[PDB]
Ligand binder design. Structure first.
Ligand SMILES: C[C@H]1O[C@H](O)[C@H](O)[C@@H](O)[C@H]1O
Ligand SMILES: C[C@H]1O[C@H](O)[C@H](O)[C@@H](O)[C@H]1O
Ligand code: NA
Lengths: 346, 339
């Protein structure tokens, strides 16, 4: 079943329920996921109206770009030319600049396929918007099926050589309450290396470090508290995790990550090379989610994309997009029950 | 009463009916007027869904900008510096460039004041969008009241010196049917001069011309067919009217123009210095409105703004917007029915 209603300020809320009774909902403001529930419990963080996003925090669950992450000094090199993008975090360009795509109302069309329902959102980034050559015709399709898979498919074409590396910014919290830390969740992540940050500004340090056998090694499932309690420099720097992890094996076919709490697991699949994980290191900010004050570590993202810092570490990849060339990315979050035995106490 | 409904592609249709039973409707797609009707008759041109505007013609009823009109070679000088804007009509920048603000979904808020209802649309034009310095935070408030007055109030603030001169692009047709020419309407217009066009590219010619006592003099009510059957080179050039008229007296209290058909009249009020009038000179294009094929001259606009061409004829005015300055503009369309 598909239901639509106004969500505030002119945005709409699109709610889908699959054959299993799982419901998930999106909004065209930022081509964003708003909620995902199983048996009455929220699996992610979200607000109850469009205004909350604009007033409290506009990133949760949004589509961010054109480039996700921080670009040191807003500087990119496109076809031998240097371009300076909007700088909204000190001299850095963070998540595409100020008032980026996550803040716009995208147009959308819903396609009902029976076992799968697709919500395709569209937006055009005009040439020069925030410094980015364009125009860029973008589209994000969010779909949910009877197998409990929520898939995100990105597509884009530019009139000019530009850069493109968007991501989905959902925050999960299997406690179903923002005021509860995700330290009690188990995390499995197929990555042997990470990208350290230079300092508090969060630009990349310049090197790639192996994390096997450290507190950031999650190849084998472990509680998130292990990282949070860590005194490793990088953890202390950000007060949790806020880094890109380099996937060891690429391919949409492999389970790159798995987040579990009791009988519920979320599996992550993607065709991208890294996953930036940020664990809501907000301290005492206490943003209210459904009237609950969010706690430090009250959520975790899995931003699949090309790792930020490629400007400094070419080995990370190349996010350039040639004129006329079609960009595509696919990321999938799948819900499972009793995938494994996870019985712990904090 | 207020009624909000889905208009397609995620856009909304907001309809307002006043004490008089008159209905006016808008959509957030392009902060635009979609319909305006009395006793079941359409007063303006409009489509039935968002899709139509995108596939047929995105201008009707829209808020166009940041700069309305044509800019020669897409070139503007800002703080002594040359800036090239998006060129979407040959080398000109027309109505702000491609995929401009008329094609975007604006956010909005409705405010019910009882005798008056306001719909405030907002949008941010990022710095650099289509070549324009910014960011520009814009708001367009469309309001309707029990006196049958449809008002448009614009406001904007820019982070950087830029240019700004938007307009409302509603097309009127008192016939209530696009397949019928507006040649039968009578027009009055308080303007003694106009801005001639250079040629078919529609860029300005360079001069300002007195129209007193010509086929374009409407200081005294006259029927459109007059102008339409004129042999004035400028009329022949565009096959109708597609020109900026300079208002003789500025100020919002003065009725600047009046469009009449029988018992029904539309008065125009504005704080802008000029009115661009375009008589839907589409030839055989035949765009479909409500299933009716549009005819050449099947509509007329009253685009109030600073006249286009100021880049070549400074006397016309200056559309610059300095950083931090608040831009404001107001245009009113008032409906009257003779009893
Ligand atoms: C909003 C968040 O988005 C990402 O996860 C960044 O890496 C974090 O530092 C923060 O900017
Ligand atoms: C869409 C129309 O908008 C204005 O009225 C212009 O002057 C006309 O030439 C046409 O471009
Ligand atoms: Na809606």
């Amino acid at each position: 079943s598909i239901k639509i209603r106004d969500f505030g300020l002119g945005s709409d809320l699109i709610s889908l329920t699959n054959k299993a009774g799982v419901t998930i909902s999106f909004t065209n403001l930022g081509a964003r996921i708003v909620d995902w529930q199983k048996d009455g419990k929220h699996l992610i963080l979200g607000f109850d109206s469009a205004k909350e996003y604009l007033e409290k925090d506009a990133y949760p669950g949004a589509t961010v770009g054109p480039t996700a992450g921080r670009i040191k000094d807003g500087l990119v090199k496109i076809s031998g030319k240097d371009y300076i993008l909007n700088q909204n975090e000190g001299p850095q360009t963070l998540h595409g600049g100020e008032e980026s795509i996550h803040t716009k109302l995208w147009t959308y069309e819903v396609t009902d396929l029976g076992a799968e329902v697709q919500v395709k959102f569209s937006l055009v980034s005009n040439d020069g918007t925030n410094g980015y050559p364009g125009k860029i015709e973008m589209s994000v399709t969010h779909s949910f099926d009877d197998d409990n898979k929520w898939k995100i498919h990105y597509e884009a074409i530019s009139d000019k050589d530009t850069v493109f590396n968007p991501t989905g910014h959902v925050y999960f919290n299997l406690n179903g309450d923002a005021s509860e830390s995700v330290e009690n969740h188990g995390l499995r992540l197929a990555a042997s290396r990470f990208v350290p940050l230079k300092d508090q500004t969060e630009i990349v340090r310049g090197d790639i470090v192996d994390i096997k056998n450290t507190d950031l090694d999650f190849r084998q499932e472990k509680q998130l508290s292990n990282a949070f309690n860590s005194n490793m420099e990088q953890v202390q720097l950000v007060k949790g995790i806020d880094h890109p992890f380099l996937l060891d094996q690429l391919g949409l076919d492999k389970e790159q990550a798995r987040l579990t709490l009791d009988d519920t697991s979320i599996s992550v699949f993607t065709d991208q090379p890294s996953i930036v994980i940020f664990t809501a290191n907000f301290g005492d900010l206490g943003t209210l989610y459904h009237e609950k004050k969010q706690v430090h570590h009250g959520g975790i993202t899995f931003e699949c994309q090309v790792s930020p810092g490629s400007e400094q570490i070419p080995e990370l990849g190349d996010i350039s997009l040639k004129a006329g060339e079609k960009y595509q990315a696919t990321t999938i979050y799948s819900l499972h029950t009793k995938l494994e035995h996870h019985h712990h106490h904090h």
